[PDB]
Structure formats: C-alpha cells, structure tokens
Symmetry: C3
Subunit: 427 residues, 3 copies
C-alpha cells in the first residue's frame, strides 16, 4: 500500500459511518415498486435496508407495513389475505392489522384475546407519483412528525436550480415530481453491496467498460481516455436543510478536462465525439444524469439495499409529455431505442464491473486497502457527505430473510435454480 | 413487544431446554425407514439428531450403527460393502465392524493391527414393527441397560387408555404396535427446524391454511374460525414413569369451544360441518390424530431432526386389517383417497406454513420475540413438558455432514440441483 | 478413541504445521496450466493457495501477476485488456502493470497521478517446460533471489538417482524436465481440502476402492488385500538442500509384504497378478508412480490448493518420445487406452473416496480424532517431513474470491448451476 494514495488514514476516518452502512442508510425514501406492479387490491412483499415490507393498494391508495406478523414472524405477503378495505391479515392464525396505523385490530381465531390493540406492526409512509411508488423506510421508533418530504431524498430540480447549477449546453432535466413527467424503466436485483454499485453509477472515468457498447459505435462517438479534475472545486457539495443532500459535478466545464493520450502506452485519441451530460448524486444514493440519452430526457438510478450483499438497481428515464402523442412517442422510442441500446446496451456492462469489485470489499478488506487516486475525489466526496448527512445506519436483519445467509431454505431455493431476489414469491 | 402476550418472562424460563434443543432431543426412539426401504442385504444411511446412522438387514433382522468409520471418517453407507452376515466394512481401507456390538473385528488391509478389538462404532437399538423401522438414537455413552421400550416414545394406546381419555364420539385408534395394524404413508425432508414443524402439527387454530383444501369442499365441511380453550385443564399432561410423556387435548368437549364469528371483520360461520377427531403429542414429538381421516383409521406424524435446520416429516395412516381383503380395501382407499386428498391435499398446505415461520426463529429471535396468545396454551404446555422430560439435548454435529453448512461439497450438490436431504446417496 | 492408534499425542505434535496448512504450503512451485491452455496473447485467471493469479503469453513467453487490481480489487483476467506487449491493464479504470516487474507503470485515465510507479502487483516466477506451465506461488515479501529451481519441487529424477533408489524390476521413469519428454493428461477441480486428496494419492492399501475397475479385470489382475510395512525403514526420507524434499516408498522389496487373506472374514487371495510400480511424494505434494501404467511411462499428480476446501487435481502421464512416430503412438495409446481406462477408469474411484473423507476433517475433528494404524506410517511420515521442510503456510484469503464462502455472488452462480471452480470465467 502506497503513501501516494488519496485515501490516507485521515481521509478514511472522515467516512467511517459510510464504511459502517453495509445494510444501507435507514430513515430515507426509496423507490419500492412501479405503479404497474401494484394494481387495485394487489399485495406485494419486498425488502429494503433489511426491512421486510408489504404493500397493498386499496381504493387507489397504497399502504406499506412491515412484512412480519407479530405472532410468529410469518411474512404476510406470502399469501395475501385481506378481509376488509382497511386491513391485512396473516394467513396463518389471522392476526389482523390496520393498514393506516398498523395496529393489531383483531385476531380471526380469537377476537377477544387481551393482546388485541395493545401493539401492532410498523408503518412506512408512502408517496406515489407519476408511475413511481416511494416508501419511507424507517426505524421502528422514528416519529411520524419527523418524516421529511420526498423531495429531500430526490435529485436537485431544474429549472428551480438552474441558476445554482448553470447548464448552458442543454435544456433543463425534468423531475419525477414534475407535472406530466413520464417514467419508463426497470429495476433488477444486483449481486453485491449497494455502495459499490452506487459509486459505479457516477464514476467519471471507466471508458474501457463502455468502449465496445453498440450505442457508442452506432452514434460514431469517440470517447476520451478519461476525465480528470483540474481544480479543488470540481464538485459542489450542497448541505442546506431544506433540500437534497448531495454533490453536483461540474462536467463539461473547465473543472473537468478530458484525457486524450497516454504516452507510456502509446495511446492517443483524436476527433472526440460524444454527448453533453452531467451527473450528480444525493442521499440516500440517487444518481441523476442530465441530458441522457437525449435532450429533455434524463436518467435516474437507485441502488436500494435489500441485505448487506444484495441491492435493487433501478434505471428510469423521465420525459415530460404534455399530450397523448408525446407519451406514445416516448413509449415507442423507449421500447425500440432507449431500453435496448441504453438501459441495457450501455448499462449492462456496469453490472459486470460492479460484481467484479465485491469480493475485495465484503469482508472489509477493500474499505481499508483500496488505493484511491486523484479522480477518486468524486466517490470520496460522496462518502464524506453521506457519512455526515444520512438519517441513520440500518442495523443487520434479525429474525427476517437475509439475517442468516446459509439456511437450508436458501439452499433449497438455490438447488431449484432461484437466485437471491427482491419481490417475495407468493404461494 | 406487548405485556399482554402469553409468553411472559416467567413462562419462557420454563422452557429454556426446548429453546436449546435445535438439534433435537437425543436418547429417544425415532422412525428411520419404512420396511420396504430396507430389503434383505440392503444397506442405507440416514441422519437423525445430527447423528449419521447406517442400517443393514441380515437374515430378516435390521441392525443400526453410526455411519462413520473410525479410521478416517468415511460414511460406510456410501458404498455398501459387507463380507459376512454379521459385519459391515468400510469401503476405503476395510475397517470392519460387528453389526451387533459395533466392535472393530478386523481390518481387511491389516488383520493383525493392534487397534483391532480395542474400539468400535456406536450401536443403535432397532425395533421394527408392522412396516416401520424405529431406531433409538442415543449419545455414545448412553448405557444399553437404560434403553426404554419403544412404547414409551409412542403415542398413548387405546383401548388401554380409553378410561383415562374417554372418547364416546369415535372408536379406539389403533397403534403401530397392534397386531394386524397396517401402515401406509410417506416421509419427506422438510426445510427448517423440527420444533417449528412439530408445533404446527398439533396447532388447533389455523383454518385459513386449510380452508381452500379440496377435501374440505368435497366433503361439504364448514370449518370454525378457530378453537378456544374454555378452562385451565383443557389439556391433560401425562407424566408417569411407565408410559409416554406428553399431553392429550380434550377436543370436542366443553373445554374447547369453536369460534363462529369475528365482529370486527364482519365474518360469521353458520351450519357447522366437519369431522370428530382428537390430537395429542408425546416426546420426542409424535402427533396422533384419532379418528382421521375416517373411523378406525388414525394419523401419526414425526418431525425427526436431521440437522438443526432440516427435519424428516413423517405422515402415516394406520388401520387394523385382520384379513387380506381388509388390507386390499385399505391399500386401495389409501392410494385413491387418503394419500392424494389427505396426506397431500390437506397437509401439503402445512408445509408452506412451516417454512414461512423458520426465518423468524433460526437466529434465535423468534424464541424470545414471538408474541403468543391464549390459544398458544397448547404449544407452551408442550414446550414445558418436553423441557422437563426429554432424555437429552443433542449436541451440534462435529466432523459429520451438516456440521458445517457452507462447504464446497454442499455448493457442488446445490449447483447440480440437489436439495438438502435425508437418505445418503450411494456410490 | 483407542490408545492403540498409531497417531498418539506425541506423533500428532510432530505435524502441527501440516494441520495448520489448510490453505496450502506457499512459496512452492505448482502446475498452473497446460501449454495448450494459454496461446499467444491469451490471458487466463486462476487461484492457488488462495492467491488469485493471472497469466499471459507474449512473444512465446508466459508471465504471471496477482489477479487483483490494486485500485479497487477487480480481477484483471475477467476481461483481458492489454495495450502493449509488456503490460496488462485493469479493464475498469485502466491501472496498468508491467508484466516483468508488476510495477504500476501508468493509469490510462490519469497518466500523471502521483500513485504511478510508487507501487505495483506481486509477480510470480514462471517455468514452462514440455507442455506444462509451472508457477512459483509465493508470499508478497518472498525475495526474488530466494526463488529455488523448479526441480526442487518436482519428484526425484532417474537415472540420476537410480543408485540411491534402486529399481531392478523396471526401467527409469522420465521427468517432465527431460528432453523429448511428452506430457498428456488433465486437471479437474476437486471438492474438498488438498491434504485429504494428496494422502489418497500415495495410499498403499485401498483395494476395495479399485477392485471393480475395468482395467483390473481386463488385465486379469488379482490384487492383494493390502500391503504391510515389515520394517521401520520401509520408507526413505530425503531432506538435503540441493534436491526435492520428500519420501521414497520401497515398494516391491522385502520391506513391503502383500496381505493375501483375512481369517476373520474368510477372505483369501491366490495367484496374485498385477504389475510392478513404485510411489513417492515430495513437497508441495507431488506424487510419482514409476512404471505406470506401462514401462517407460510414469504418472505424476498434484493436488493444488485453490482455497481451504477446493483443490485442482492434476493427472499426467509422461513418456520420452524421440521421434514424431513415437509421439503419435503415445498420443494414440493415451487417447484410447490410458485416459479412458486409467486416468479415468482407475482414478475416478479415488475421487469419491476423497470426497467421502472431507466432512470428518474440515471443522478440524479428523485431524485429532482420526484413528490411524500401522499402514499409516506412510501418510504420517509425509505429514512430518512436510511440517519440517515446507517454505511457508499460506494465510486465509482476504478480499479475494474464496475469502468468504457464502456471498450472494456464490449463491447466484450456484443457482445458475455452476460448481466451485478454478479457471476464472471471462467477460
Ligand atoms: S404467525 Fe401470523 S397469525 Fe400466527
Ligand atoms: S476410512 Fe474407513 S477403513 Fe480407512
Ligand atoms: S479497479 Fe482497476 S483501475 Fe480501478
Ligand atoms: Fe458506466
Ligand atoms: Fe394444518
Ligand atoms: Fe487409488
């Protein structure tokens, strides 16, 4: 280990909380499911930051509760059983909970037991908007009154912040919160810790990973060997109380210069061609790529922790569609252009890159022995701000799926060919 | 956690030994194989309470020894090798053991080695009766003279105990020990700890689990929302010396009342239709369902621990058949009625219920945080009596299969599509 | 455990280092790949003694470096990326290393970073000869000047040592180091620890394992129930500096008598038929079987540790072939005789024997509780010399594949049907 690395002892001590958050940052908003994944009266189970969650849509409204019966720990979502519009019951003995408050309102097989009403399961605030269902995954004792607005855990908004983050080279990127904003995309279970996936999301220099992508050649692009910071303020950190906590990278400005050659290897690029775009990231780990893949379109990504070694990788493209014609045009171009060539053709390569790093980090080795460099100012800055502003560090799961990794149930599923997942399989 | 739960600190302290019995209660009788699974000269390896056992039938008699060669720990059952009617040899170097005493009688490759006769492998008492082969799984040092009759670890017998446990609504259930008693059934490896499976076996209140079963609708049954104990003595605990240790539930008496409605959810059942039956459980964890599925027929179940997270679930139906005409009728009705509609159609639902509870309990959480209620007086009473009368708590396996859960051998098998099992694969 | 076993406390204390070497003996020469597995410009990743290694052939010469990028730990071999004839680059951010010295010569994405040249990856000496690519797997700090000749880690040579180890019943066995020596064979990943496999390699008494082999009956052989040492100098131990460290077993001499009967079991062999052969083993665990399967042909095996519970089992046959005709005869007889009837037909049985032993030993039980006998003077002698002359005990892997055994990555691969392996999958 060289003393010339960027991550010296002092620096590493500045992001200890981040090193400690393998299970994720709790008390934050996370995308749970696309709207189309939960129709009226549908019930679905998932897991975020190690917390088992079950959601149900009733009268058009989505509710979320901990997917764990108080009686004997059964997952309510495995066999959806609801007797009324305001409740959900456990399919084993009938412990029943109120969707709104999570209170144990009754027990099917024992309506007069003294336990009824004296406790209940945890509730998680929900915010559904433009095809996205967000859930505020919080600790059991996080007060309702303390729940912040969804916008605080979503990327910076434009043109609201165009003045703060000037972008003369491209039109304003829409937000999932914008009126008539349309979302198209997917989320796939990723194998490995969420942190490693997230940092890959906004890495500025990994051309080798995408050099062979079809889109790069179809568009006749000529990528740079890399991008390096020219000054200390190449990244702007935002920490105000009313707004998202993250960093904005001044791409396509003077603060970031493209590398066109490597004298040692005899490499040299000329006539660079490409796209104008800009990446930024905010807590709990949300990427925004302005002007990608095309003008007026934007890409957002999440790397939602499920357990400490699996995450749900979200990729969505957003575009405001005023008319019905606009929606059809966006849907069509997504289906035969963006989805195959970008969300897949471009980003699938990132998957192998992320998995390739996991072994160095899981047992803790990489978090100490990695040898970061000048370009790593990006991830380092992110780790520091994340350590300073996260609303909590999730505790390891206990008495839930993922608490123990080598159970006979997991071997049974693996023998059956089932990979680690996200959505709970129903009976 | 609510103070209104039935399992308060005082109560939990009364079943600490049961919380400690993950690997099972040792020094007890368990079903090993059906007679048809071991023909003359056949050898078969299994695992119970973490103890590897190999069985062989010679001259009609079955013998059981520890499936572990003293030399270098190879499982003798993997490649059945026997040179005489009274021995079994290890297929590697030929260490040979006496079927009766387990003594090392010779070594094929070294007939004059000083080790010969100075040691041997553990022997396990066998008691085969009416198609069932029971083995007394004991610790290496449990004295032969202390081995109790098989009856002591088998459910209460009738009419012998008809006076003690009156049953005016149905005829006496036969025992597998009875003359002309015929056994039909099966055993399947269950994924999860044995205790969780056993408790489900005699659970009185779980209609939601069997409400959709085909047999319930074919018979025009109308099940109750649940059964409630009306008095303190709703269960009779038997603790005599000469006999089985367990509890008899006074079903279909005024001590247990059905629940026909739930005012909170607006549920109500009318026109009560079903079957008369009674359940009881005795150590090491054997269920008896009198008058099921029909008169003169009885269902018995075992949840034999294999490791601490797998068990072998036995389901058998017994009926005394004097003539071979009776045997053909029973065999026929089993094949086209009891098996598909009951052992499978009814009980398969219990399998999903058991697996769903396992994650809450394996790491210890559930045994402390479960919130039991009034109806849980059944399992609690069983846990207490089991803690008081078990003949021993099995220790974790060491130097045997299951001792380590994530070996490269287990991953090889899993990769090949093989689920965790019970019967040792040969060659 | 009997006091009559050969491995008493005193004896066991003489091979504690061997008990401690689950991950293998490091700072030794091991077979890495066959020449045909690495063509010009081909890159391949492997793992030995827990050390990830990447090899590449440039201008006919093979180089070996640690398969771990020092930036963020990705395996360089997953996506072979080389810009010049003297380097290899990480496919993520372009950290580039010199094949010869392993020094970090540059970073494609940052040519002027201060980290450049201040560090690098470990290099491993390579010795390619007669179709075999050997690599000296060493600790990071093992000095270049201390790297010994490949011969020191290869079996004893003949006729060079014919006087020291007289062999009047057969002609001299060739070495892979001999001019015109031709190698034919294979290596397969084994599931279990390397020590267990190695000891089976030179075991003299396991007729039951090979009795049914086709070659035994096709050749009308009549094997002995076993072989016994008649004197305590039945094995010669060689320990001087200039040469291999190991032992020679005086097979087919007065020191090893065959066992033809077992009075206890009524076994008795007559007219024993077979062939003359001789086994010896040297560090790091290399078997030599002289005069097998035929005169002028010799079998060599290696049990290369990959992790502490997997190894790469090598089986090769060597014969000096002066002319092109000789090579065609050898290639032909290998393909339709040696490979199917010997390397497979005979040794495949050894695979099941090895796997069957692993469970007793992995958690440490067998290394203490195994009950060895007179014939075990063979493996005991090996354990002792190995403990005394090994050049190092490999440390468990940290931050590399195999460091953690139950990652979601491993469950993903297993779910997809992939068994634990050796050669790193590319892309
Ligand atoms: S486990 Fe849910 S009601 Fe019993
Ligand atoms: S391992 Fe059984 S005789 Fe050697
Ligand atoms: S991980 Fe190898 S250059 Fe970054
Ligand atoms: Fe990328
Ligand atoms: Fe049931
Ligand atoms: Fe062999």
């Amino acid at each position: 280990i060289s003393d010339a690395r960027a991550n010296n002892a002092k620096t590493q001590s500045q992001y200890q909380p981040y090193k400690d958050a393998a299970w994720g940052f709790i008390n934050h908003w996370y995308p749970a499911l696309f709207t189309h994944e939960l129709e009226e009266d549908q019930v679905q189970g998932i897991q975020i930051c190690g917390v088992p969650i079950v959601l149900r849509r009733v009268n058009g409204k989505v509710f979320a509760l901990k997917d764990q019966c108080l009686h004997r720990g059964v997952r309510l979502s495995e066999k959806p059983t609801c007797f009324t519009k305001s409740t959900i019951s456990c399919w084993y003995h009938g412990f029943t909970f109120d969707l709104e408050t999570g209170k144990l309102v009754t027990i099917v097989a024992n309506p007069e037991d003294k336990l009824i009403g004296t406790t209940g399961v945890t509730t998680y605030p929900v915010h559904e908007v433009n095809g996205m269902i967000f859930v505020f995954v919080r600790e059991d004792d996080f007060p309702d009154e303390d729940v912040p607005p969804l916008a605080h855990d979503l990327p910076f908004r434009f043109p609201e912040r165009s003045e703060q983050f000037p972008h003369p080279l491209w039109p304003s990127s829409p937000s999932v919160l914008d009126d008539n904003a349309v979302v198209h995309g997917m989320h796939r279970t990723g194998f490995g810790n969420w942190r490693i996936a997230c940092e890959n999301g906004f890495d500025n220099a990994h051309i080798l990973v995408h050099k062979d992508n079809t889109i790069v050649h179809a568009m006749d692009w000529v990528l740079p060997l890399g991008l390096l910071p020219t000054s200390d303020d190449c990244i702007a950190v935002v920490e105000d109380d009313d707004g998202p906590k993250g960093m904005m990278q001044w791409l396509f400005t003077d603060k970031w210069a493209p590398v066109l050659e490597n004298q040692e290897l005899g490499l040299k690029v000329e006539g660079l061609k490409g796209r104008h775009y800009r990446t930024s990231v905010v807590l709990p780990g949300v990427l925004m790529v302005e002007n990608w893949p095309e003008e007026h379109v934007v890409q957002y990504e999440w790397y939602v922790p499920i357990t400490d070694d699996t995450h749900e990788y979200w990729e969505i493209l957003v575009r405001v569609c005023p008319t019905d014609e606009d929606r059809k045009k966006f849907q069509y171009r997504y289906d035969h252009m963006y989805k195959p060539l970008c969300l897949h053709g471009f980003n699938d390569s990132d998957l192998y890159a992320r998995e390739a790093m996991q072994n160095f980090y899981y047992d803790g080795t990489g978090w100490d022995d990695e040898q970061l460099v000048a370009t790593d100012i990006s991830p380092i800055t992110w780790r520091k701000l994340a350590s300073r502003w996260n609303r909590g560090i999730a505790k390891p799961g206990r008495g839930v799926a993922g608490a123990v990794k080598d159970t006979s149930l997991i071997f049974k599923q693996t023998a059956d060919g089932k990979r680690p997942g996200y959505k709970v399989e129903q009976i």
